[PDB]
Amino acid sequence: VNSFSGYLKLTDNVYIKNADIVEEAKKVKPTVVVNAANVYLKHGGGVAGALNKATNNAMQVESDDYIATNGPLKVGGSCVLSGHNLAKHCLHVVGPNVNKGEDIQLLKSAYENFNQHEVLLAPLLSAGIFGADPIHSLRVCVDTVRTNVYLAVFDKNLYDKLVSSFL
Numbered sequence: 574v575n576s577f578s579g580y581l582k583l584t585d586n587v588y589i590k591n592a593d594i595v596e597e598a599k600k601v602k603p604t605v606v607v608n609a610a611n612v613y614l615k616h617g618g619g620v621a622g623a624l625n626k627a628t629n630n631a632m633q634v635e636s637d638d639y640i641a642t643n644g645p646l647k648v649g650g651s652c653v654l655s656g657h658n659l660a661k662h663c664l665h666v667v668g669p670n671v672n673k674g675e676d677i678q679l680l681k682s683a684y685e686n687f688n689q690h691e692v693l694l695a696p697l698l699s700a701g702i703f704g705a706d707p708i709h710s711l712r713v714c715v716d717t718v719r720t721n722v723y724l725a726v727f728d729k730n731l732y733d734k735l736v737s738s739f740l
């Protein structure tokens with residue numbers, strides 16, 4: 574038994590809720606929150622800017638030190654950093670950005686990072702401003718992630734469509 578509330582169960586291991594990932598992290602304080610990162614860990618907008626804003630920019634300060642030491646992530650890759658005031662840990666995961674020409678086949682690689690963590694609060698990778706089809710992203714999530722994932726879908730209307738079209 575964990576602390577996630579009001580999620581609809583899609584599979585043995587995948588749960589979904591129409592909710593803002595920021596407000597959910599603040600309430601639950603999960604072990605792992607997933608950020609929809611880019612390879613530079615430049616958290617300007619979407620999940621990354623909203624998560625970063627909620628940390629008062631401490632996520633961006635930590636991230637800049639990480640990049641100065643290690644260089645950029647790979648598309649499909651990840652790193653574990655602090656969760657600040659939102660979670661124990663933040664798993665920064667880089668899904669492909671369709672609005673930049675990145676290979677959508679890298680979405681499966683991106684979701685494989687989640688398998689290193691027993692439980693996660695996450696957004697749909699490559700959905701929203703990343704320009705990929707969220708229905709596809711949910712299918713890849715269900716078919717790739719084997720650990721327990723709690724998906725926070727921000728768009729109400731999208732949430733209803735994801736549930737109603739789920740196979």
Ligand SMILES: O=C(O)CCc1nc2cc(Cl)ccc2s1
Nearest residue numbers: 619620623696700701726727728
């Ligand atoms: O779930 C969706 O509706 C699409 C992917 C998401 N995009 C964002 C953007 C922000 Cl600022 C906050 C949470 C989310 S989750």
